[PDB]
Symmetry: D2
Subunit: 212 residues, 4 copies
């Protein structure tokens, strides 16, 4: 596509997008065009408005576009073209990505005892309510656990809420502690969001006993 | 995929799917699996139910699956496996396609007079509220008009309702009447549904005057 | 989207799209924009060309866009804007849908004998190589058979060729002939294409014997 | 979906998936089912093989599934069910995600001089050939630069190669240096892959002069 300003909008919150170069107040020669999950290709929106789109996105007095409550289907491209009172045309191009932050992740069915030298289920980490899905990862004494490493096995599951579309993730960790290891290792699980610069969320740690 | 019974479900109406081979009343060893626009791959539903799926699809006492009001996102595959009291396992496989019937199509901005030998806009046909989109087509005195045949030009547009997802179609017909033709031709437009065996809907005819 | 000329392009064949209002020969101030399965939103193509797109779609000397061999991923929207030598700007807007015609459909595993009053497998109809998928339907003595009617059952299956993406459809018909019916009914199966105004393809008929 | 082992497969490389619990050599009672970008819902593959799938994925003598060169369309779910010689059934469930590593990112059109207190284009970072798209981000003297923080503006662009589907990303950085800042700041850009645990790639730094 073209060069755009990246916008991240939290699901359920309002979004205002500026129409650069629009006069401060009506009358304004400007048009918004959007291509999102709601549209078939481009939809044009104008300051006059009208119709079912008035429930979803409306042009404000200063020419900005306003969505009262962003949904998953509002992901897409939003563009404005405006003429100021001198006749200069200015374009605005936005790429809108939407997100939701899950609840704090939790470890369920954690083991209190592990046996060295054999596979053990350590626990299941669960995160509910993310968009985009994001990922779960396990840590041992502050270091990432890698499933490709020997003695670590992970299985993962993704589900969607049938009404909101938000993701629930589940990650089951199994480990084979090596003979002579730490008898009280500390495990935790982290949720890493799908979008850049969003912070990870971490579970409370667990500390099983390992039997030699 | 596998062999399935095809099911067409009107948006907004309930749907009941039979679990073949299930005992008539509980207790029943049966499981439903669905893969639809609501799910990430397969979701399992059981007679006990529970959780947010209880608002969307529930297993009934006789083991059938019930959706109180089908939506676009319920398109997909629905499967049951049941054991009867004899121990025999029976599988049911359904492919569910959803639809909505638009309002009767209308011709707007129809021309009252055409001039022979030059291009004329005849009118614009509009259909609102279909799923899947379907198509619009023009007829002249009961015969289909085919674009790219000489003297016929059509342009078409598709939009979606931002909240319901249903389609609005628009079709603009232009013709070049051939000299010596009928001075009072009769045009109409028809909506053809996307699914098989659904009936076409037709507009009232228009009858412009052609000037030689 | 906007009003467009609908274009149907057969997979594997060339496609030429006219840039209306472009000068007959270079130099030309014109630009093509396309949004297809190949692109992330709009891609701009110019008479100079260059790069990997030169293998897929190139602007010709008269300004038309040329694709030597259309694929499934070329479905989408193609637009031109040109200035003629007088300074007038002209826009062209095309909605391109692609298709492939399957081989003639065939009935396999047809029954030679049916028993009245009980369910019988009549046969399986198969169509290979369509795009979009299209549908199969059964006919009895020239009349459509409807699965919603008593004594008719149909199951259907869709597969895709892993390399070409073209669809293979299969339809299995079962019937319960009513006591006292025709002892030599004639069945056939028809493939109905997904796009409008494309012709159906029909199998050779079968003529089982029915036992009272 | 169900619990699965997550598998990451580099585009263009072979992939082997183990059928757990299968006998070491034929004969084997086992079946693979796949649902990927190539399939309509599930496709069953068997040790005998045959047909066009033999060019894409084949069952090996030990029952493993083999793809000689993974493509984007092989993303999806791969499952095996096998019986050993004892009669025990074992299931294997894999979620396959595909990727490609882009070339090292580069900064083009970097500025040699910036002026304090006014917006300046610093440069454009470009990464070619990734899957999934991934993201570009700017750093100043080793610290992430965050847009929407005062004096930082970023615009971004995504394109796809028309034949391979791989992504090219472009990111243009503008900054307003604050008066009294470092006259020789050091900027760099990093590519962050879409999949977890894949390493970032970084450009060579640039060091413009800032004029007070
Ligand atoms: C590349 C690019 C960036 C920002 C805005 C636009 C517009 C536009 C948007 C709203 C109204 C009129 C034109 C167009 C077009 O449609 O030509 N291209 C754009
Ligand atoms: C090919 C086919 C047709 C109909 C039902 C199923 C089921 C199933 C559905 C619900 C519960 C348990 C199994 C499965 C499977 O998952 O093996 N395959 C099926
Ligand atoms: C609604 C509509 C129909 C046909 C062409 C265009 C173009 C365009 C196409 C190629 C080059 C420059 C502009 C645009 C735009 O981008 O504004 N809108 C269009
Ligand atoms: C939940 C789950 C995990 C792993 C494999 C399967 C299979 C399967 C796969 C290949 C062949 C036969 C059955 C099925 C099914 O289809 O019932 N469910 C599975
Ligand atoms: Cl789900
Ligand atoms: Cl729309
Ligand atoms: Cl398939
Ligand atoms: Cl692109």
């Amino acid at each position: 596509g073209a060069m755009a300003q990246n916008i991240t909008a939290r699901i359920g919150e309002p979004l205002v997008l500026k129409c650069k170069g629009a006069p401060k107040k009506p009358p304004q020669r400007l048009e918004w065009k959007l291509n999102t999950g709601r549209t078939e290709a481009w939809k044009v929106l104008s300051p006059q408005g009208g119709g079912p789109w008035d429930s979803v996105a409306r042009v404000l007095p200063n020419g900005s576009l306003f969505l009262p409550a962003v949904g998953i289907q509002d992901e897409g491209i939003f563009r404005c073209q405006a003429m100021n009172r001198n006749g200069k045309e200015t374009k605005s191009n936005y790429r809108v990505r939407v997100y939701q932050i899950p609840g704090k992740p939790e470890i369920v069915d954690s083991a209190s005892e592990l046996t060295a030298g054999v596979p053990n289920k350590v626990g299941t980490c669960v995160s509910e309510g993310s968009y985009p899905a994001g990922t779960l990862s396990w840590h041992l004494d502050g270091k990432p656990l890698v499933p490709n490493e020997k003695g670590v096995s992970v299985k993962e599951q993704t589900r969607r809420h049938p009404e909101t579309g938000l993701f629930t993730l589940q990650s089951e960790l199994m480990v084979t502690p090596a003979r002579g290891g730490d008898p009280r290792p500390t495990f935790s699980c982290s949720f890493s969001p799908g979008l850049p610069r969003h912070r990870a969320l971490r579970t409370a740690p667990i500390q099983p006993r390992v039997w030699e």
